[PDB]
A paper describes a structure:
Two symmetry-related molecules in the P11475 crystals interact through the VL CDR1 and VL CDR2 loops and a composite region spanning the FR1 and linker region between the VL and CL domains of the light chain. Charge–charge interactions are established between residues Arg110L in the VL–CL linker region and Asp50L in the VL CDR2 loop. Residue Lys16L in the FR1 region of the λ-chain protrudes between the VL CDR1 and VL CDR2 loop, establishing a salt bridge with Asp52L, and an interaction with the helix dipole of VL CDR1. The characteristically short VH CDR3 allows a close approach between the two receptors, but establishes only one direct hydrogen bond with the epitope through residue Asn101H. Computational calculations of the binding energy also suggest a weak interaction, and indeed dimeric species of the P11475 Fab could be detected in SV AUC experiments only at a protein concentration of 20 μM. Since the high absorbance of more concentrated P11475 solutions prevented the measurement of KD, we resorted to dilution isothermal titration calorimetry to obtain a dissociation constant of 430±160 μM. The most recurrent SHM in the light chain of subset no. 2 CLL cases (Ser93LGly, numbering according to the deposited P11475 structure) is positioned at the tip of the VL CDR3 loop with its Cα atom in contact with the opposite receptor, allowing a closer approach of the BcRs for homotypic interactions. The most striking finding stemming from the structural analysis of the subset no. 2 IgM is the crucial role in self-recognition of the unexpected Arg110L residue in the epitope, corresponding to the splice site between the IGLJ3 and IGLC genes.
Author numbering:
A (entry chain L): 2 to 212
B (entry chain H): 2 to 129, 142 to 158, 171 to 187, 203 to 218
């Protein structure tokens, strides 16, 4: 048995989000919904098609008919940002549980925030370890999509760059870090190294130098 | 009412590993118990289940003939013996109770199937204040006194920003920062 979900739903705050779960005559089965915020355990937010477990707010509701089950979230808040999974239970089979592929709920149009960038040179204890690592820390920005350009002197650098994907913090803003691995000679050789993080079409300039 | 998983860590392919789940706050013998996993960046996948009283056992087709579930009602614990581990088994394993609908979940425990060897972090203090841990595996680091870890050359690195202590299964490290 196959449960299909759209991979992504995106809505603004206060608006309604609808997550669908497609299945053959799924209206004849009981459908449960799980909410999984990043880093947390999953939470049963809707069970038996439309009922709410104790503790779940009333703006969460569900329904199930025909070949489509729906999870509706009204008055969406930033906190509702999570992956949502539908699930059914088939008694007399060797595979009782069936989970949907999951749907990522993104909450758009939250207050925009420029990134707070911090650029650490290689530690003097690291240079005595025959290593040189630049650390570009990027904090408190929204939306959570940035591009990082590492420049030596005034020229692009692509090798030795390891940039992470932004993860959401507790305050619903994003943080990311970028590492530029150099030999201690690649470091002292150049007059500067730059971490030009671009967010929403606006670079935040920060240069570091061995001297 | 709570579920606490443990036993997860780094293992080489073809190796074996036993997962343990500790239940508390409810009558353990009155509920069916389940194992559900989640590969990095992917969806939930049911693995195995054991029923209450009768103890009928079920498995997913990708784990049959290798995984073994069981329980100890006197100790309120659920087990998952995993044998012949492959790369496809790398995931965060959740312990969850009840049938039909899983009402209670644990925060899970991570299982990493890899040929690479385990290592403790190496701390370097940062000044512009920061703290830089490198060359640790698996990626199960916590910072005490927050940024996500990056993968470089098969090993992970992580930075914290505010005396810098860390928690890693292979070794706890402390380091001084001006």
């Amino acid at each position: 048995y196959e449960l299909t979900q759209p991979p992504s739903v995106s809505v603004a705050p206060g608006k309604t989000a609808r997550i669908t779960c497609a299945g053959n005559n799924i209206g004849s089965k009981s459908v449960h919904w799980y909410q999984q915020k990043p880093g947390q355990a999953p939470v049963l937010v809707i069970y038996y098609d439309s009922d709410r477990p104790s503790g779940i707010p009333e703006r969460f509701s569900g329904s199930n008919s025909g070949n489509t089950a729906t999870l509706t979230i009204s008055r969406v808040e930033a906190g509702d940002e999570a992956d949502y999974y539908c699930q059914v239970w088939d008694s007399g089979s060797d595979h009782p549980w069936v989970f949907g592929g999951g749907t990522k709920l993104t909450v758009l149009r939250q207050p925009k925030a420029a990134p707070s960038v911090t650029l650490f040179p290689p530690s003097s204890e690291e240079l005595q370890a025959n290593k040189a690592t630049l650390v570009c820390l990027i904090s408190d920005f929204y939306p959570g999509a940035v591009t990082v350009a590492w420049k030596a002197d005034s020229s692009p650098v692509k090798a030795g760059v390891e940039t992470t994907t932004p993860s959401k913090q507790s305050n619903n803003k994003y943080a990311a870090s970028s590492y530029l691995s150099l030999t201690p000679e690649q470091w002292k050789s150049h007059r500067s190294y730059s971490c030009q993080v671009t967010h929403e079409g606006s670079t935040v300039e920060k240069t570091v130098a061995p001297t | 009412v709570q579920l606490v998983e443990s036993g997860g860590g780094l293992v080489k392919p073809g190796g074996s590993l036993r997962l343990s789940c500790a239940a508390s706050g409810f009558t353990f013998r009155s509920y069916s118990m389940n194992w559900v996993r989640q590969a990095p960046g992917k969806g939930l996948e049911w693995v195995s289940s054991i029923i209450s009283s009768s103890s009928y056992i079920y498995y997913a087709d990708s784990v049959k003939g290798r995984f073994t579930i069981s329980r100890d009602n006197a100790k309120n614990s659920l087990y998952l013996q995993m044998n012949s581990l492959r790369a496809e088994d790398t995931a965060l394993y959740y312990c969850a109770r009840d049938q039909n609908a899983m009402d209670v979940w644990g925060q899970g425990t991570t299982v990493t199937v890899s040929s690479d060897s385990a290592s403790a972090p190496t701390l370097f203090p940062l000044v512009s204040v920061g703290c830089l841990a490198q060359d640790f595996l698996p990626d199960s680091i916590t910072f005490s006194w927050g940024f996500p870890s990056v993968l470089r050359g098969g090993k992970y690195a992580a930075t914290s920003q505010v005396v810098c202590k860390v928690q890693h299964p292979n070794g706890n490290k402390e380091k001084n920062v001006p």
